[PDB]
Amino acid sequence: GVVDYTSLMALAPRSKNFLELLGVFSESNTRYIDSRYAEFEREEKGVTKMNAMARGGSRKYIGSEKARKEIIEVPFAPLDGVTVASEVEAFRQYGTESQTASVEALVQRKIEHIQRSHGIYIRDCQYTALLKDKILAEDEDGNEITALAKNFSTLWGVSRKTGAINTTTAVNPFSVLATKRQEIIDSMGENNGFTSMVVLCTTRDFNAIVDHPDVRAAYEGRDGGAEYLTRRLGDAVDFQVFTHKGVTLVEDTSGKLTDGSAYMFPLGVQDMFQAVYAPADSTDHVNTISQGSYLFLNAGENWRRDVIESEVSYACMVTRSELICDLTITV
Amino acid sequence: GVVDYTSLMALAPRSKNFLELLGVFSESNTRYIDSRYAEFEREEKGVTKMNAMARGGSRKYIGSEKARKEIIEVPFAPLDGVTVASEVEAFRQYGTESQTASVEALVQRKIEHIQRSHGIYIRDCQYTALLKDKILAEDEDGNEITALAKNFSTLWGVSRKTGAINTTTAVNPFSVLATKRQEIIDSMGENNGFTSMVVLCTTRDFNAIVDHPDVRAAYEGRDGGAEYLTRRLGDAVDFQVFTHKGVTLVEDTSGKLTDGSAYMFPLGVQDMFQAVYAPADSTDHVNTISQGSYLFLNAGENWRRDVIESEVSYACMVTRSELICDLTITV
Amino acid sequence: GVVDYTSLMALAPRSKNFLELLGVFSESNTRYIDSRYAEFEREEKGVTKMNAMARGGSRKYIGSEKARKEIIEVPFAPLDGVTVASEVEAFRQYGTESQTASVEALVQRKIEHIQRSHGIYIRDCQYTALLKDKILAEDEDGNEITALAKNFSTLWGVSRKTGAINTTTAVNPFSVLATKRQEIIDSMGENNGFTSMVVLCTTRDFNAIVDHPDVRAAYEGRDGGAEYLTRRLGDAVDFQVFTHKGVTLVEDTSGKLTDGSAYMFPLGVQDMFQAVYAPADSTDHVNTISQGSYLFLNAGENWRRDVIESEVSYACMVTRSELICDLTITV
Amino acid sequence: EKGVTKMNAMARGGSRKYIGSEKARKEIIEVPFAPLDGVTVASEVEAFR
Amino acid sequence: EKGVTKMNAMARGGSRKARKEIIEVPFAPLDGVTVASEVEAFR
DSSP states (O other): OEEEOSGGGGGSOOOOOHHHHHTTTOSSSEEEOSSSEEEEEOOOSSSSOOOSOOOTTSOOOOOOOOOOEEEEEOOEEEOOOOOOSSGGGGTTTTTTTSOOHHHHHHHHHHHHHHHHHHHHHHHHHHHHHHHHOBOOOBOTTSOBOTTTOOBHHHHSSOOOEEOOBOTTSSSOHHHHHHHHHHHHHTTTOSSOOOSEEEEEEOHHHHHHHHTSHHHHHHHHHTTTTTOOHHHHHTSSSOOOEEEETTEEEEEOOSSOSOSSOOEEEEESOTTSEEEEEEOOSSSSSTTSOOOSEEEEEEOSSOTTOOEEEEEEEEEEEESOGGGOEEOOBOO | OEEEOSGGGGSSOOOOOHHHHHTSSOGGGEEOOSSSEEEEEOOOSOOOOSOOOOSSSSOOOOSOSSOOEEEEEOOEEEOOOOOOOSSSOGGGTTTTTOOOHHHHHHHHHHHHHHHHHHHHHHHHHHHIIIIISBOOOBOTTSOBOTTTOOBHHHHHTOOOEEEEEETTSSSOHHHHHHHHHHHHHHHHTTOOOOOOOEEEEOHHHHHHHSSSHHHHHHHHTOOSOOOHHHHHTTTTOOOOEEEETTEEEEEOOSSOSOTTEEEEEOTTOTTSEEEEEOOOSSTTSSSSOOOSEEEEEEOSSOSSOOEEEEEEEEEEEESOGGGOEEEEEEO | OEEEOOGGGGGSOOOOOHHHHHTSSOSTTEEEOSSSEEEEEOOOSSSOSSOOOOOSSSOOOOOOOOOOEEEEEOOEEEEOOOOOOOTIIIIITTTTSSOOSSHHHHHHHHHHHHHHHHHHHHHHHHHHHHHHSBOOOBOTTSOBOTTTOOBSTTTTTOOOEEEEEETTSSSOHHHHHHHHHHHHHHHTTTOOOOOEEEOOEEHHHHHHHHTSHHHHHHHTTTOOOSOSHHHHHHOSSOOOEEEETTEEEEEEOSSOSOSSOOEEEEESOTTSEEEEEOOOSSSTTSSSOOOSSEEEEEOTTOSSOOEEEEEEEEEEEESOTTSOEEEEEEO | OOSSSOOOSOOOTTSOOOOOOOOOOOOOOOOOOOOOOOOOOSSGGGGTO | OOOOOOOOOOSSSOOOOOOOOOOOOOOOOOOOOOOOSSSOOOO
């Protein structure tokens, strides 16, 4: 005795995170797998490398295999903690025919509460993947599950870069930023086609870097001058941006970044950031196409109560971590 | 002989006061409870739902066991003062295959007036909760009902921090503000999800605290890209904002805040400012999900008149009162 | 697929504990509330809940006044003993209609066991309330739940009197009890209506104090018996009573008191000891008046057996906790 | 014994119902058998009355 | 690598996290073989 209410979860579509708005974990590089386990492929030169010159008449190259590919388990996080009292049994009292205003309001409030909660968990997963290079999997007590929190620059065999920006000293911060940009470019090689070079920093770090004597005049004159790629692509989100010496300073106002810690990384690199939604934990949605976030009304359980079961499986992957630099500002 | 016109009251949604625009109280932290009593949970040092959780057959935690909950009674406030004229009873004709333009105009004007009054009441409640650190329950003679005027600091066993700013001495006010900022940051613990650090004040306090010799030049040489406050909340509220040293002085232009007192709180902290909506006061509207503000047409109370009955039960809640600092400004 | 069998709980009502027999708790002050939360009013402001009236025709004035009150959540403790031998559902398959031979025996045993266990629980609650001033809330391992184990000396801001009597010493133990009788008398106020000055203690302490040189001349040299009001009223149990100098010693042989703990408190004071029952934990039994101790027959939840589920929600209350004078006896 | 029907505790409204049973002291003994069959009816109406 | 030990319980009351990894199984064909048209007796 369980009713599926996942289709109703589109009444309150999720907003876009800051990362999801920059395009880092966009809706393009996001899949809906059919199983608990997800295969993340690293693009390598040689597997589709036609090259060579063969010979007209025979010996056709059947290039395949020898591709780096690790399968991980998508962590499972339920938000089933709930107890509907009446709630129209979350059924909207036959939401098609007898949809009253009170029932619609209660349904919308519950759906928007379920969304804003999964979206926070998804944001935590994304920021953990970007800032700490691991899958977000922790116990209820708050201790990481080593059996599911696979590190990123260990699974592939890469290592991030480092940095140091003392804005109190006279050295230009953008000199160091450009040097690290060049070091990151040198580590791409084959395709090396990227939209922009962004530096994700906090408000304090942003204002400390910008207010440097070497950069002030430059910021005062332009301050972006409405001629930035991000400002022209979004044109609606309001955050500080600054393009100078090839690196685009971006201000993150969410509280997720510790002060004195910026993360350089390139935008537009293909399959550098991937994420996927695994299916539910039921025996009817197993081996079934994932729907993102799942909502179920449980009435066959204990006759005393009646619970609203909600769940989501979501894991992020950084398939090339050599291109991210962990800066350290000393404002 | 009463007709429920609560549904029609969404025709003219009330505007947002300064606290709603600033993000202190919004639709994200507002719950439509179904009883006279509201339960508020204090999650100290970070709140993050939707953890990883094992997949398939596993524990779907639908409730919390170890917590810190409090129960309060949400004050009631009706504003029935009205008299629907026999012409102002076009409500019975609205949306009934006879709704002309005049009927819609009249009903929307009435609803706009009622919502203006309700928004004034709600603004009073929110400002009382933010500044006075208590629930707004006051008798017709302006005397506080001690039964319903619960103080948050005593309700949680915490105490707001205090500080004194002397804008006539040689000490820099912003050094003191930075010390209070550091104290608040230390108090937040592992949350650190704060978007900004607002210091709400009045025109006199703002103009006297920034004209200090150590901050006069910085104010004079400021930029129009102060922060999200001047950007996001721009073109709607003409206020004065000046970010400096991490603390964002914002001056209030509603008169609800008195001179000589400033309140310094972090924006964006999750489950720090909460609001609830009780249901109506009627046996037909008991044990039901609240609809916010109610509008009833009482056409069976007298033979002479026909009164419009309007009512709302609402209360704000500050679950983290150790993160707000009360500042005394001596001009 | 359950069936409600709480009506049969009246076929064998529980016995009457020593405190219940003594009149400390009774069915007069025992409210069967409708919600999970119980409201207790300390009506210490004389007696003005009801009074005289006048002005026939129309002077009803139905609205009451407001006094000091506290809202607490009553603990919910089940005992799903299960292990129901088939025996046609162990009750002739609801064989309370054609209850010919075996129903009135197996059923009688089942309820005489269930209500015996519930009476043990309720006696524990009452003794914890009177001896320790707190609601009995415990975990499975025996760790107190602080959310529900609300003390009584802080919920009302009153302090119990304390004393110590050394039987070995030469001071008359009843002289000490004479003074602390007055201390409780003064705090009663102007609505003093106590029946007796109960000094309920243990057998060892009773024997030690009555064997004091000053006391034995009156205990042996009098103790008229069948003249003490408690002895005449009860006359159905084995307990020693000695009413000397107003003080009315009562030996408690129930084993709930640790030696050297005499708890002096007035008896018969109206609304000083209150008890509350709460409904079950079912959707059917929500917003329903408490029916005492519940009992259900769960069959379809499992296949290996059929389960009987008993659920009692109970909590005592000592409002005027300033009259109980805990004592310490050294022998 | 205290504990087998000890509802006590405080559980929690919504789940975790205590199914208290077992761990009860219980010994099974054999009931001694004593016959008083020593008798010999002569007529006695064959004790059939 | 954990404990699955059994323990005593009651007549009622229910009573009763493994790291597994997925790999690609290497493929190895030795299809080099020619039928002699007399070894076509595989019928």
